[PDB]
Structures are given as structure tokens and as C-alpha cells.
């Protein structure tokens, strides 16, 4: 690593097929209860407008 | 009757047509369910008119 010109820093990486260890943390996904959809039919529709 | 309150929606949508009557008599509705239905038949006797 420190072979060339200005020396560099070493790091190693495990290939994808194997870690096999790293720290595996269970992650509970949470979002607020009650997601609801409304259909607001336009008041005062026209032929040249929508409101 | 299917109604929406306070963001969640779809309350009572599964209730019986008649069930609406029972949790309201709970409040003293005071009219019989026959009249709350409300419709009536009255068959005639004599040939050969409709009822």
C-alpha cells in the first residue's frame, strides 16, 4: 500500500458472498396509524375553471 | 349508513340495516322497528286486484 510515490492507507473489504460477521441489528419500521384517502369533489367547477 | 369520524373512515359500514335501529333505541328512539323500517304491505281480499 505504502509502495508508491506518496504512500496510501490500507483497508480490506470482504467479498459479497461472505462477511460472515458484522453487527446485524434488527430494525422495527414504524409510521403513524391511520392513513386514509379522501375524494374532494370540486366546488364551483365550470368550463374554464376548476376549484 | 357508513360514516367517517376524525380521520379514520368506514365506521359502521358492516352493520345491519336494522342494527342501526338497535344501538339507537339504546338512546330511547321510542318508535317500533316495523315503522322505522319502514314500509308496509296490505293484501286485499276480492278477485283479483293488486295489493
DSSP letter at A41 equals P
- Chain A: nearest CA to B8, how far in angstroms? 6
Torsion, Cα of B3, B7, B10, B11 (10° steps): -60
Q: Count CB neighbours of A21 within 10 A.
A: 7
**Cβ pair A50, A42 in contact under 8 A:** yes
**Helix or strand or coil: residue B9?**
strand
In angstroms, this model's resolution equals 3.5
Contact call for residues A25 and A18 (beta carbons, < 8 A): no
C-alpha distance across the termini of chain B, in Å: 30
The alpha-carbon radius of gyration of chain B (Å, integer) is 17
Chain B hits for A36, CB-CB cut-off 8 Å, are 7-9
Could you tell me if A8 and A2 are in contact, meaning their C-beta atoms sit under 8 angstroms apart? yes
How remote is the C-alpha of A49 from its chain's centroid?
39
For β-strands B3-4 and B9-11, DSSP reports them as antiparallel
Q: Obtained via which technique?
A: cryo-EM
Check residue B27 and report its DSSP letter.
T
In A, which residues are within 8 Å of B11 by CB distance?
none
Amino acid at each position: 500500500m505504502s509502495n508508491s510515490a506518496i504512500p496510501l492507507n490500507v483497508v480490506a473489504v470482504q467479498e459479497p458472498r461472505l462477511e460472515l460477521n458484522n453487527e446485524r441489528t434488527w430494525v422495527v419500521v414504524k409510521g403513524g396509524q391511520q392513513v386514509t384517502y379522501y375524494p374532494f369533489p370540486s366546488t364551483s367547477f365550470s368550463s374554464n375553471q376548476f376549484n | 349508513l357508513n360514516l367517517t369520524w376524525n380521520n379514520q373512515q368506514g365506521i359502521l359500514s358492516g352493520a345491519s340495516s336494522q342494527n342501526l335501529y338497535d344501538f339507537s333505541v339504546q338512546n330511547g328512539y321510542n318508535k317500533t322497528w316495523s315503522e322505522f323500517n319502514g314500509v308496509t304491505q296490505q293484501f286485499n281480499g276480492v278477485s283479483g286486484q293488486p295489493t
